[PDB]
Structure formats: C-alpha cells, structure tokens
Amino acid sequence: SLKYIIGMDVGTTATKGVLYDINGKAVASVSKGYPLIQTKVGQAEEDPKLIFDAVQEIIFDLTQKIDGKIAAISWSSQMHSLIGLGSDDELLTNSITWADNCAKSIVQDAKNRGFAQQIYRKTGMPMHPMAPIYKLLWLKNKKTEVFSQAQKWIGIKEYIIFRLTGKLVTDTTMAAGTGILNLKTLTWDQELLDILKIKKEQLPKIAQPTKVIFPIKTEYVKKLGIDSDTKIILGASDGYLSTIGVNAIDSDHCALNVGTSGAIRTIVDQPKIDPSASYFCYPADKTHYLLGGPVNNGGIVFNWARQTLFDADETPQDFLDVAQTAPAGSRNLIFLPYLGGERAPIWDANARGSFVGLTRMHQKPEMARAVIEGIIFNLYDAASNLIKNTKKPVAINATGGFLKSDFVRQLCANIFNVPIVTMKEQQSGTLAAMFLARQALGLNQDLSEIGQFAQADKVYFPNPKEAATYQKLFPLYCEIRNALAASYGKFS
Missing domain, CATH: 3.30.420.40 (ATPase, nucleotide binding domain)
Structure with missing residues (x-):
C-alpha cells in the first residue's frame, strides 16, 4: 500500500538508483559502477550487459529496503551513447560513449566540407565526435561489416528499457543528443538519414519523457522484486533532467x-x-x-x-x-x-x-x-x-x-x-x-x-x-x- 518511485541515473562509470516515497522524499539510494573500456587512445566503450546487470541489481536492492509497491521506475541517462543491434536484437557493438573519439577525423572532414556546420544548423549538435551521427558515419566507412548487419541503432537507455520491456523507445531529449533529430520537426532529419544511409525504421520511435512503457517482462518483475503493474517511465537525458532538477x-x-x-x-x-x-x-x-x-x-x-x-x-x-x-x-x-x-x-x-x-x-x-x-x-x-x-x-x-x-x-x-x-x-x-x-x-x-x-x-x-x-x-x-x-x- 505504501507506494515508491525509483529514479535511475545511468552514468558513464556508474548507475545511481534513488528510491523516493510518494512524497518525493529520497529514502534510500544505491549505485554500482562498471569499467569503461579504453583499450587504446580515444576509445571509450562499455558493456551494455554489464550496465544492465548493475541496473537489475540496483533496483532489486532498492526494493529490498522497503515494504510496498514500486509505482514507477524512471530514467536519467548519459547522452550520445551508441549501440548497434542485429536482426536477432543481439549486441553488434558495445556502448560507444560520448567520450569515444573514433569519429574524430570524420568530424574534422565534415567540418572542412561545411557539413558539420549543417548538422549543427539542423539538429543543434555541436561539431564534436561525441555525436552518434558522426559515430555512425565512421562505422559506415570503417566498420562496414557491423554496419551492414545493424538493424537498430540505439543508446544505453533505449537498450535498458528494451531489455525490460521488449520495446524500442527513445525520448525527445535523448534523440536530441544523436545529431539526427531535426530542431524544427522534432523528428529524424530525413536529409541526414539519407546521407547516413540509415532508415527511420532502424531507430527507436520517439516519445515524451513521461511516456509509460508497459508492461515489464515477467522475468524481471520477479528478478527486480517489483509488481506486474510497476510502470517504466521513458525518462530523458542527464543534461535535461539535471537542469529541470535544479x-x-x-x-x-x-x-x-x-x-x-x-x-x-x-x-x-x-x-x-x-x-x-x-x-x-x-x-x-x-x-x-x-x-x-x-x-x-x-x-x-x-x-x-x-x-x-x-x-x-x-x-x-x-x-x-x-x-x-x-x-x-x-x-x-x-x-x-x-x-x-x-x-x-x-x-x-x-x-x-x-x-x-x-x-x-x-x-x-x-x-x-x-x-x-x-x-x-x-x-x-x-x-x-x-x-x-x-x-x-x-x-x-x-x-x-x-x-x-x-x-x-x-x-x-x-x-x-x-x-x-x-x-x-x-x-x-x-x-x-x-x-x-x-x-x-x-x-x-x-x-x-x-x-x-x-x-x-x-x-x-x-x-x-x-x-x-x-x-x-x-x-x-x-x-x-x-x-x-x-x-x-x-x-x-
């Protein structure tokens, strides 16, 4: 009968979970970290499975701490992360974080041709290799293999939610950090999709951050110690949420x-x-x-x-x-x-x-x-x-x-x-x-x-x-x- 909300923050080196009561008072918090894969210079990746494991562990530990219902689990997440899914919905890549520089040459050249200026003018994305759009271009031209078989291009938040729900959804604020979302239309920029050689279909649908994603697969309802009516709130980016959060x-x-x-x-x-x-x-x-x-x-x-x-x-x-x-x-x-x-x-x-x-x-x-x-x-x-x-x-x-x-x-x-x-x-x-x-x-x-x-x-x-x-x-x-x-x- 006591109701609680869990707020999740999926960071670059850790997820932080915080359990609030129906009054908004934080009553507990648990966070767990993960390694950032940095084999060589400029590389900054991470295992989505690692991240999801922390996520389950955090939620469960939070549910252990109270006796009541978890009304909703909501999401704040790092930005600019990029993950490729196969026809089997299987991981083609790790999570390539915002900090990865693999696309750094692509940006310079795009910047040389006046193309980066165009992406920015269209999507509000600064000319930086943290952007998925640039990460994708690089994959399309030096990792042709995985790019060939990628059916879905998503981020760590989309990935976590998809694991729990079987749904591929991103929110406006998160899409705003891909470098592909048009500022005027607030949908994928077709002109950019065409140059990327990507299809609207290979991308999460876009919804409001408040969208309820239901239901949670029974596997995790049990695992995470929650109810069958525990809602997933789509959430938004750390950048947006940190601003409205102050x-x-x-x-x-x-x-x-x-x-x-x-x-x-x-x-x-x-x-x-x-x-x-x-x-x-x-x-x-x-x-x-x-x-x-x-x-x-x-x-x-x-x-x-x-x-x-x-x-x-x-x-x-x-x-x-x-x-x-x-x-x-x-x-x-x-x-x-x-x-x-x-x-x-x-x-x-x-x-x-x-x-x-x-x-x-x-x-x-x-x-x-x-x-x-x-x-x-x-x-x-x-x-x-x-x-x-x-x-x-x-x-x-x-x-x-x-x-x-x-x-x-x-x-x-x-x-x-x-x-x-x-x-x-x-x-x-x-x-x-x-x-x-x-x-x-x-x-x-x-x-x-x-x-x-x-x-x-x-x-x-x-x-x-x-x-x-x-x-x-x-x-x-x-x-x-x-x-x-x-x-x-x-x-x-």
Whole structure:
C-alpha cells in the first residue's frame, strides 16, 4: 500500500538508483559502477550487459529496503551513447560513449566540407565526435561489416528499457543528443538519414519523457522484486533532467553544475543556434529547448593545480585558503584552464592551459587564485554564449563538488554578477526523473511544480567591488583566449 518511485541515473562509470516515497522524499539510494573500456587512445566503450546487470541489481536492492509497491521506475541517462543491434536484437557493438573519439577525423572532414556546420544548423549538435551521427558515419566507412548487419541503432537507455520491456523507445531529449533529430520537426532529419544511409525504421520511435512503457517482462518483475503493474517511465537525458532538477525550467534561470568537469545550461522557448556553434541546442519538446555547453575543465583542473602548484599533500582547503590571500583578479594574471582540450565554449580538442601576464608581483597565491578564477571565467565564457542577444538569467542554480566552498560560490557570484543559488539536492537527475514519474502517475501536472522538490539552499549575491573588478578583468581573459586560439595545433 505504501507506494515508491525509483529514479535511475545511468552514468558513464556508474548507475545511481534513488528510491523516493510518494512524497518525493529520497529514502534510500544505491549505485554500482562498471569499467569503461579504453583499450587504446580515444576509445571509450562499455558493456551494455554489464550496465544492465548493475541496473537489475540496483533496483532489486532498492526494493529490498522497503515494504510496498514500486509505482514507477524512471530514467536519467548519459547522452550520445551508441549501440548497434542485429536482426536477432543481439549486441553488434558495445556502448560507444560520448567520450569515444573514433569519429574524430570524420568530424574534422565534415567540418572542412561545411557539413558539420549543417548538422549543427539542423539538429543543434555541436561539431564534436561525441555525436552518434558522426559515430555512425565512421562505422559506415570503417566498420562496414557491423554496419551492414545493424538493424537498430540505439543508446544505453533505449537498450535498458528494451531489455525490460521488449520495446524500442527513445525520448525527445535523448534523440536530441544523436545529431539526427531535426530542431524544427522534432523528428529524424530525413536529409541526414539519407546521407547516413540509415532508415527511420532502424531507430527507436520517439516519445515524451513521461511516456509509460508497459508492461515489464515477467522475468524481471520477479528478478527486480517489483509488481506486474510497476510502470517504466521513458525518462530523458542527464543534461535535461539535471537542469529541470535544479528548478531551472525557463530562460530566466540556468543551471551550472561543476564537478570534475562541469556544464552550463538553460531552457528556452524555441530552437536557438549559435552562428559559431559554441553551444548545443537539444530539444525537450516543441516549446522547450535545452541550450548548454559541456565544459571539460572543472575541478579536474583545480586538482591538477592543487598538486603541481603545491604538492600531493595540499588539501583543497589549503589551496583555497592560499588562493584567497591574493587579491581578486590575481593582479591581472590570466589562466586559460584548457588542460584537457575543451568543448564549450571554444570547442577545441587541442587546447592547452596557459598562465599569461606573469610578473614578479605574482607569487603562489596569485597563481593559485588565477587557476580558480580561470576555471570560473571559462564557465562564465560558456554561459555568456548562451545569453548574448538575450536577457541575463536572474540567478544561477548551482551544484557540483567544485562549488562546495563559500569562496567558490561567492567567486561565481562575483564573476557572473548574478546571484548564485545553491541547491539542497545535488542529485538533480534522479529527482527530475522521479518527477517525470509523478507526472506520468498524475501526481503532478505542470513542470513548475518540480520547484517543490528542487529546493534552494543558500544564495550568494555579487559583491559590487569584486564584481566590477571581474567585469573589467573578463575582457582581458578573452583577449588572452583570443590571442592563443590559433596556436594550439602547433603543440603537436
């Protein structure tokens, strides 16, 4: 009689399961990881069966923890993953994650012919090999065999649901990450299908994220410890769900999440692409489009700095404390954070990091702070691409282990010059997935109602003097970024 919803988040190295009660309160959570197959450079795959096994195990462990009915299982999932199915519905490939670079030459050449520009103009997909469309082109031209026999081209979410249900369905937000979904029609772009030599039929049908997929094959109903009336909610992408999961549901807001890597996103009225293609446009539905930039150089870069700038025994707090002993602006020291190449905002895989403007006035503190300001300046750089020619958001809804400290939160406010709102719940994806279920179940109607579950915690307001300092220092950051943009290829 007690009813529960399970929100699943199928990540790159782990799935996280969270069990909510009919009130939306998370009562338990279990996650299990899997290896990412990286035999050689650029390769980033994973075994779908591995992933599904974790999935069953997670759900079952969650059901063990309560005595009641699992009303629905909802899904948040990594994006850009690609899996091929045979005529037997058997796995022709592993899950080729967004991180796999196999298609990296295809992109460059497509980019050379003005074709990548066209895909982007049509689908809102940045010119990057993370996209299935590019992954497919590569398979069609260097793995002709498996491409020949592929009857279905799907992603890990489609795959999991198909295992449980015998249905091949994807949601709009997930399709938005293939590079094949037309922005205007919100269906597969025929022109692209023809060039891919793929058929509308070899692709999941597209539905709303709230679609109920019923029923679950009895095999798993038993295995997973659920009922015969446990609904599967189609779910959506981690990118979309993480944004609505921090209550960033309209253009007046945006979501900034920063962990090891980070992301800035906002949701808008209509498609909206960038002349420079510096941000993605992933449709959710006809009146909701996710704009954003994935940013590689988040806390991963902070940790690099922590260690090489000091030593391996330098705590993150030690680093923050030292950084703080330097003035805001780090006496005009610029740090371009592009350690691992970069997607948004510069979309250059060859990019490297730089310290520019060194002087004998710049000591350890100044370099410490410049790192953190650089990481933040870069995120602000990506955010700014989103909202140029439009109204600045009224707040940034913030999450991520990198934003854990008051200092970084305050620094973000001061750099972005809008208030920074930290959220009570970091797990935006499973929360928003859980919310989708509540919609499907008729427990909630409008998206705005998700605000009830996604609560604000702390607000940080821009400090006027520092804000002015950073507003004057940002253009210099962009000068140095611009100055070096063309130089990174030289490095190899």
